[PDB]
Amino acid sequence: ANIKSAKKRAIQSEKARKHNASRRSMMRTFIKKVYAAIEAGDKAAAQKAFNEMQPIVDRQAAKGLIHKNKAARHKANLTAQINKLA
Amino acid sequence: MVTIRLARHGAKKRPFYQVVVADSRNARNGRFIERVGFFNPIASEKEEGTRLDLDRIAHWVGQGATISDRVAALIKEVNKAA
Amino acid sequence: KIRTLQGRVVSDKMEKSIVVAIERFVKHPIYGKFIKRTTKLHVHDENNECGIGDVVEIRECRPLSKTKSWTLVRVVEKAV
Amino acid sequence: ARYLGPKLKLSRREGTDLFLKSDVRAIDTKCKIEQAPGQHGARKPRLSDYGVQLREKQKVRRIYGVLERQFRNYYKEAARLKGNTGENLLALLEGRLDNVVYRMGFGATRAEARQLVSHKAIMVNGRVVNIASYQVSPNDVVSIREKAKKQSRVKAALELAEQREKPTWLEVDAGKMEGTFKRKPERSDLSADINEHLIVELYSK
RNA sequence: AAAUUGAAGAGUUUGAUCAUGGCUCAGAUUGAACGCUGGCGGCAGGCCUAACACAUGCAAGUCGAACGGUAACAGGAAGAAGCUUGCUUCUUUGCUGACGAGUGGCGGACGGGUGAGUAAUGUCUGGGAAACUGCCUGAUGGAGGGGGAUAACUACUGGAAACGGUAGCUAAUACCGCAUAACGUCGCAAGACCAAAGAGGGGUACCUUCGGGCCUCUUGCCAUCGGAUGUGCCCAGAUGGGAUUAGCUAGUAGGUGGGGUAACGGCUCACCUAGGCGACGAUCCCUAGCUGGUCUGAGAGGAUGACCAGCCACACUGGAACUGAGACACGGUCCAGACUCCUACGGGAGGCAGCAGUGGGGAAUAUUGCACAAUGGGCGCAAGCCUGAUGCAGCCAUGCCGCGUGUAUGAAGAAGGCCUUCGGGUUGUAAAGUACUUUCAGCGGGGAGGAAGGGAGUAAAGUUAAUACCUUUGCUCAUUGACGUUACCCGCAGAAGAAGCACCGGCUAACUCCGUGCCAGCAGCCGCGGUAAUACGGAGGGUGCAAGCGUUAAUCGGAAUUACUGGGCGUAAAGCGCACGCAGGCGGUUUGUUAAGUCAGAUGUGAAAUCCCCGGGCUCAACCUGGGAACUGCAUCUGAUACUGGCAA
Ligand SMILES: [Mg+2]
Ligand SMILES: [Mg+2]
Ligand SMILES: [Mg+2]
Ligand SMILES: [Mg+2]
Ligand SMILES: [Mg+2]
Ligand SMILES: [Mg+2]
Ligand SMILES: [Mg+2]
Ligand SMILES: [Mg+2]
Ligand SMILES: [Mg+2]
Ligand SMILES: [Mg+2]
Ligand SMILES: [Mg+2]
Ligand SMILES: [Mg+2]
Ligand SMILES: [Mg+2]
Ligand SMILES: [Mg+2]
Ligand SMILES: [Mg+2]
Ligand SMILES: [Mg+2]
Ligand SMILES: [Mg+2]
Ligand SMILES: [Mg+2]
Ligand SMILES: [Mg+2]
Ligand SMILES: [Mg+2]
Ligand SMILES: [Mg+2]
Ligand SMILES: [Mg+2]
Ligand SMILES: [Mg+2]
Ligand SMILES: [Mg+2]
Ligand SMILES: [Mg+2]
Ligand SMILES: [Mg+2]
Ligand SMILES: [Mg+2]
Ligand SMILES: [Mg+2]
Ligand SMILES: [Mg+2]
Ligand SMILES: [Mg+2]
Ligand SMILES: [Mg+2]
Ligand SMILES: [Mg+2]
Ligand SMILES: [Mg+2]
Ligand SMILES: [Mg+2]
Ligand SMILES: [Mg+2]
Ligand SMILES: [Mg+2]
Ligand SMILES: [Mg+2]
Ligand SMILES: [Mg+2]
Ligand SMILES: [Mg+2]
Ligand SMILES: [Mg+2]
Ligand SMILES: [Mg+2]
Ligand SMILES: [Mg+2]
Ligand SMILES: [Mg+2]
Ligand SMILES: [Mg+2]
Ligand SMILES: [Mg+2]
């Protein structure tokens, strides 16, 4: 890039991209674990995974990696499925 | 940020500023929410040099609009003249 | 108190939905002769209670499908 | 931007006195007024209605020293104004500063009055006005400036002024060389051989 | 009170007439181009064609009051020396004023450009709910205690360069935990869970490791709920041409459920149902950015969308995501392509549809200008810095408006030219001469206004422990203008520096002579020209416009010649060969009811500018501007029930 601020913005955007990718992948991993627990049908294991997942999505939403609405939607969906499970 | 500022239309070497309330991002002589008076720097001294609808100005200021230095100067000068 | 349209059901072969035709008089823009114009709207019909030809009262709502944005408030007359 | 050529030629073409000379001398002692200018002036033209309309417009224009563009704008303004279109056109024409100066008699002719206006010799409300087409309004005071009041031509012109008919709607004090435009002149007080309705037709053909 | 007041025809078919009918002209307007000519000023305007390619220089930075620091310059402090004894000199010391590079915060998503695409994912009008919203603003509370790094830097090192690579070092308002938690999120509840950052100014005492702690003020950070602004989304109507395009559509149409989004949603899936659109024109093709508006028109309309403003789309072509409140991003990233360029041939760089400018295309469209003084915009406590936005200047008669190019007198009707039936007539008061003035240009002198502010001191009121600091309010001082030698005013000189273009057969205002001889030539149509041509060319005279005038191109008008207002069809162009008949259009008469159409009233809205009315300011006008009318519409509500419609009889 030709402009001085443009170069620095590109560098900062790459750094932020790597940090955000790490944290977002962590959150998605913890969600997919509870989805696999649901697909295995154990209420207890899925509840353990859900109550460990809950504090992390709220913190990432508060830190701006995702929206509060997205975190709340995830919590609502998982609670719905877990309660609807036998 | 809502701001109260002057939209200079006038003519060459004969400016006639129009006090307008607008989003600060829009261009100067562009989209404005509401006009609240006028100011003519050149004055015959028998004309109305500045007219300000202070009530609507206060309404928007209370809502949270900021004020350009020149609009604040105009408001202060008219209230001082009164 | 609520904006509303009135029309007749022209087709009900869809699951939980119906298409209603709203007809109105409009003065022709140039010539002037009042001409009938029709607007067909895909309407949401829970319970599929509307038969073809029925006259139904409709109101606008949120998008319910790709095309459905109106819901049936009441049936006015049915099975003419 | 102004007609500078011979003046009596226009009067000969229009077939009447246009007051393009001071008047001190009878115009028939200065030219063959009753004959059209040119090699074939003696022949008489069987003139069409369009011809007579054009001749009427040209007569008024050459009386007031106004060119076609300015006269067209005057007609547009008169048509816009409320009331009889021809009458307000005549009022607008008679409201020119040079015409007012000539009526008050500071110039022997409208051209001399126009030169007086142009050369910073006329004041309106104590302000120097140098534009010929300045519209004078009722209750205006037009005065000769002190510095230009000693010009011999104005003191000469006041005699011709007192020898022609005195307009009703102007009050002129010749001693102080100041005058008051009391009111806009009506149709009846100015000459009745101007067929303004011909001009109204010409600007609607 | 006012918001209108408003409409012209002519030539041409025939031996002559009336009609039908086409062609042509007279009017305005232009982002105009060309030809002849050309003084000044004000305002406005200036690649419509190649979104063709681009040399060069500028168009996005800012904060030391977030931080580590000191490369540079200015100090100081130590510090010896030249030696004049401190007049300087070298050397450290980020100790100070500040600041290159760097981390970090905010801003590059605004401002500016263009109209390729787009016939509806767009725009205009009117509605709506299922959403977000940096900075701004109101309220309510918090603001605890830790941790591991990484730039900068140093060392080594690859490459021609671009750009890198390995190893150590340091900091924060960078990053990550842990504590804390409701009116916040999830849930029916029960509960569960979730955050933060300091910095600056001053300081009575008091403690102190002399750093500070501590008090106070200002600003900053976190959470929730609002306000406003902006944005995303949904519906209806409107929004070109073609029917020598009649059928189109399988995520297509709907449903259940899962997933995804800030949000509803075939947005995406899995399955089920087999639908959806269309003659009220779907689909397909061609063409085109839309609107307020502009030109024209009496009006309805026709055309049009330059400049100003609102909206959309694009940023070499195609595609994609990331950061972020906001982009799938003009002067950001990655990939592909065509180009152009650097080379060590391995590799790389670039995107004027930003401002000037170059080449090219074309009939045709300008300066590689000055300034941040005013209005805004970004950062900042502020000073201030940046700003080809903007304010101004330069170029052009491109348009509109104004002004001058002299005024008066002047018959010997001079001379000369032209005509002459030879007497004269005409150019013509025209000139000359004789009087007068000096606008504008030229020279000299004065001089507004665009300037508000900001900085320093003072004083008073807050302030709190504090007459500190800071905020507000005064008062005092010296200052801030690109334009600019400004507008404007005063003085000098001298009529002195300044008039062209088209036409003259009829339409259409203005006529003769000479030359020419159906040749040369003219022409918008009718038409001219073959021996006296008012039509060709020259002269004299005249007519119309005027610093312009003519020619061409394009739109409306005239054109009632797409006729809705406002036309026709026996013979002039025009009644299908005839009948039935579906969709569609219309429908006898009475009563009731309905309020759909219709009418009345009210509300909201119809952005600003433009048009119009009454005024105001530039010496007038153009131009700028105040208030109003208007924007004939759309939607909602309450009324009227004659007419049309629905229903009933
Ligand atoms: Mg002019
Ligand atoms: Mg242009
Ligand atoms: Mg720095
Ligand atoms: Mg823009
Ligand atoms: Mg902490
Ligand atoms: Mg550290
Ligand atoms: Mg916690
Ligand atoms: Mg933090
Ligand atoms: Mg259009
Ligand atoms: Mg669903
Ligand atoms: Mg949808
Ligand atoms: Mg196009
Ligand atoms: Mg018409
Ligand atoms: Mg885009
Ligand atoms: Mg290009
Ligand atoms: Mg691209
Ligand atoms: Mg993001
Ligand atoms: Mg882009
Ligand atoms: Mg950008
Ligand atoms: Mg560029
Ligand atoms: Mg350019
Ligand atoms: Mg060329
Ligand atoms: Mg500035
Ligand atoms: Mg710069
Ligand atoms: Mg600059
Ligand atoms: Mg002679
Ligand atoms: Mg001068
Ligand atoms: Mg000043
Ligand atoms: Mg004639
Ligand atoms: Mg001959
Ligand atoms: Mg000819
Ligand atoms: Mg001859
Ligand atoms: Mg000829
Ligand atoms: Mg033409
Ligand atoms: Mg017509
Ligand atoms: Mg006919
Ligand atoms: Mg026939
Ligand atoms: Mg028949
Ligand atoms: Mg019927
Ligand atoms: Mg009936
Ligand atoms: Mg109704
Ligand atoms: Mg408006
Ligand atoms: Mg005035
Ligand atoms: Mg106004
Ligand atoms: Mg009825």
PDB file of N, CA and C (backbone and C1' of nucleotides) in Angstrom, chain E residues 460-472:
ATOM      1  P     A E 460     -11.237  39.430  42.896  1.00  0.00           P
ATOM      2  O5'   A E 460     -12.709  38.903  42.599  1.00  0.00           O
ATOM      3  C5'   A E 460     -13.821  39.779  42.698  1.00  0.00           C
ATOM      4  C4'   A E 460     -15.055  39.189  42.063  1.00  0.00           C
ATOM      5  C3'   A E 460     -15.393  37.762  42.453  1.00  0.00           C
ATOM      6  O3'   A E 460     -16.038  37.668  43.711  1.00  0.00           O
ATOM      7  C1'   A E 460     -15.563  37.992  40.113  1.00  0.00           C
ATOM      8  P     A E 461     -15.872  36.342  44.605  1.00  0.00           P
ATOM      9  O5'   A E 461     -16.826  35.281  43.896  1.00  0.00           O
ATOM     10  C5'   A E 461     -18.222  35.516  43.789  1.00  0.00           C
ATOM     11  C4'   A E 461     -18.866  34.591  42.789  1.00  0.00           C
ATOM     12  C3'   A E 461     -18.676  33.103  43.033  1.00  0.00           C
ATOM     13  O3'   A E 461     -19.560  32.580  44.007  1.00  0.00           O
ATOM     14  C1'   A E 461     -18.231  33.583  40.770  1.00  0.00           C
ATOM     15  P     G E 462     -19.046  31.561  45.108  1.00  0.00           P
ATOM     16  O5'   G E 462     -17.982  30.677  44.319  1.00  0.00           O
ATOM     17  C5'   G E 462     -17.949  29.246  44.482  1.00  0.00           C
ATOM     18  C4'   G E 462     -18.712  28.583  43.362  1.00  0.00           C
ATOM     19  C3'   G E 462     -18.312  27.137  43.076  1.00  0.00           C
ATOM     20  O3'   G E 462     -19.313  26.238  43.534  1.00  0.00           O
ATOM     21  C1'   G E 462     -17.752  28.527  41.242  1.00  0.00           C
ATOM     22  P     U E 463     -18.977  25.205  44.699  1.00  0.00           P
ATOM     23  O5'   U E 463     -17.500  24.729  44.344  1.00  0.00           O
ATOM     24  C5'   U E 463     -17.263  23.745  43.325  1.00  0.00           C
ATOM     25  C4'   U E 463     -15.784  23.495  43.184  1.00  0.00           C
ATOM     26  C3'   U E 463     -15.050  23.116  44.459  1.00  0.00           C
ATOM     27  O3'   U E 463     -15.218  21.746  44.811  1.00  0.00           O
ATOM     28  C1'   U E 463     -13.778  24.680  43.205  1.00  0.00           C
ATOM     29  P     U E 464     -16.343  21.325  45.874  1.00  0.00           P
ATOM     30  O5'   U E 464     -15.531  20.495  46.966  1.00  0.00           O
ATOM     31  C5'   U E 464     -14.503  19.564  46.595  1.00  0.00           C
ATOM     32  C4'   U E 464     -13.159  20.032  47.097  1.00  0.00           C
ATOM     33  C3'   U E 464     -13.057  20.314  48.586  1.00  0.00           C
ATOM     34  O3'   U E 464     -12.800  19.124  49.321  1.00  0.00           O
ATOM     35  C1'   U E 464     -11.970  22.023  47.338  1.00  0.00           C
ATOM     36  P     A E 465     -13.058  19.087  50.899  1.00  0.00           P
ATOM     37  O5'   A E 465     -11.834  19.916  51.489  1.00  0.00           O
ATOM     38  C5'   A E 465     -12.063  21.113  52.255  1.00  0.00           C
ATOM     39  C4'   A E 465     -10.796  21.573  52.937  1.00  0.00           C
ATOM     40  C3'   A E 465     -10.179  22.838  52.355  1.00  0.00           C
ATOM     41  O3'   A E 465     -10.783  23.938  53.020  1.00  0.00           O
ATOM     42  C1'   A E 465      -8.503  21.178  52.778  1.00  0.00           C
ATOM     43  P     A E 466     -11.502  25.062  52.167  1.00  0.00           P
ATOM     44  O5'   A E 466     -10.350  25.496  51.154  1.00  0.00           O
ATOM     45  C5'   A E 466      -9.891  26.839  51.113  1.00  0.00           C
ATOM     46  C4'   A E 466      -8.449  26.921  50.681  1.00  0.00           C
ATOM     47  C3'   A E 466      -8.205  27.214  49.208  1.00  0.00           C
ATOM     48  O3'   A E 466      -8.275  28.596  48.896  1.00  0.00           O
ATOM     49  C1'   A E 466      -6.875  25.381  49.872  1.00  0.00           C
ATOM     50  P     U E 467      -9.609  29.208  48.240  1.00  0.00           P
ATOM     51  O5'   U E 467      -9.241  29.419  46.706  1.00  0.00           O
ATOM     52  C5'   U E 467      -7.948  29.848  46.309  1.00  0.00           C
ATOM     53  C4'   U E 467      -7.859  31.349  46.265  1.00  0.00           C
ATOM     54  C3'   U E 467      -6.561  31.918  45.710  1.00  0.00           C
ATOM     55  O3'   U E 467      -6.557  31.969  44.295  1.00  0.00           O
ATOM     56  C1'   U E 467      -7.092  32.999  47.746  1.00  0.00           C
ATOM     57  P     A E 468      -5.181  31.836  43.474  1.00  0.00           P
ATOM     58  O5'   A E 468      -4.464  30.565  44.110  1.00  0.00           O
ATOM     59  C5'   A E 468      -5.016  29.266  43.964  1.00  0.00           C
ATOM     60  C4'   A E 468      -3.941  28.221  43.803  1.00  0.00           C
ATOM     61  C3'   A E 468      -3.826  27.594  42.422  1.00  0.00           C
ATOM     62  O3'   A E 468      -3.063  28.381  41.520  1.00  0.00           O
ATOM     63  C1'   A E 468      -3.851  25.893  44.058  1.00  0.00           C
ATOM     64  P     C E 469      -3.634  28.750  40.064  1.00  0.00           P
ATOM     65  O5'   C E 469      -4.031  27.345  39.427  1.00  0.00           O
ATOM     66  C5'   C E 469      -3.040  26.436  38.970  1.00  0.00           C
ATOM     67  C4'   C E 469      -3.652  25.108  38.607  1.00  0.00           C
ATOM     68  C3'   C E 469      -4.780  25.160  37.587  1.00  0.00           C
ATOM     69  O3'   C E 469      -4.316  25.199  36.248  1.00  0.00           O
ATOM     70  C1'   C E 469      -5.461  23.860  39.435  1.00  0.00           C
ATOM     71  P     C E 470      -5.085  26.083  35.148  1.00  0.00           P
ATOM     72  O5'   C E 470      -6.511  25.391  35.014  1.00  0.00           O
ATOM     73  C5'   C E 470      -6.658  24.107  34.423  1.00  0.00           C
ATOM     74  C4'   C E 470      -8.057  23.581  34.609  1.00  0.00           C
ATOM     75  C3'   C E 470      -9.169  24.475  34.081  1.00  0.00           C
ATOM     76  O3'   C E 470      -9.397  24.323  32.692  1.00  0.00           O
ATOM     77  C1'   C E 470      -9.682  23.822  36.285  1.00  0.00           C
ATOM     78  P     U E 471     -10.070  25.516  31.854  1.00  0.00           P
ATOM     79  O5'   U E 471     -11.590  25.519  32.327  1.00  0.00           O
ATOM     80  C5'   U E 471     -12.478  24.477  31.953  1.00  0.00           C
ATOM     81  C4'   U E 471     -13.880  24.760  32.428  1.00  0.00           C
ATOM     82  C3'   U E 471     -14.443  26.117  32.035  1.00  0.00           C
ATOM     83  O3'   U E 471     -14.982  26.138  30.725  1.00  0.00           O
ATOM     84  C1'   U E 471     -14.775  25.785  34.342  1.00  0.00           C
ATOM     85  P     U E 472     -14.962  27.496  29.866  1.00  0.00           P
ATOM     86  O5'   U E 472     -16.102  28.392  30.527  1.00  0.00           O
ATOM     87  C5'   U E 472     -17.450  27.944  30.574  1.00  0.00           C
ATOM     88  C4'   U E 472     -18.296  28.849  31.433  1.00  0.00           C
ATOM     89  C3'   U E 472     -18.215  30.329  31.102  1.00  0.00           C
ATOM     90  O3'   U E 472     -19.058  30.695  30.025  1.00  0.00           O
ATOM     91  C1'   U E 472     -17.959  30.036  33.428  1.00  0.00           C
TER      92        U E 472
END
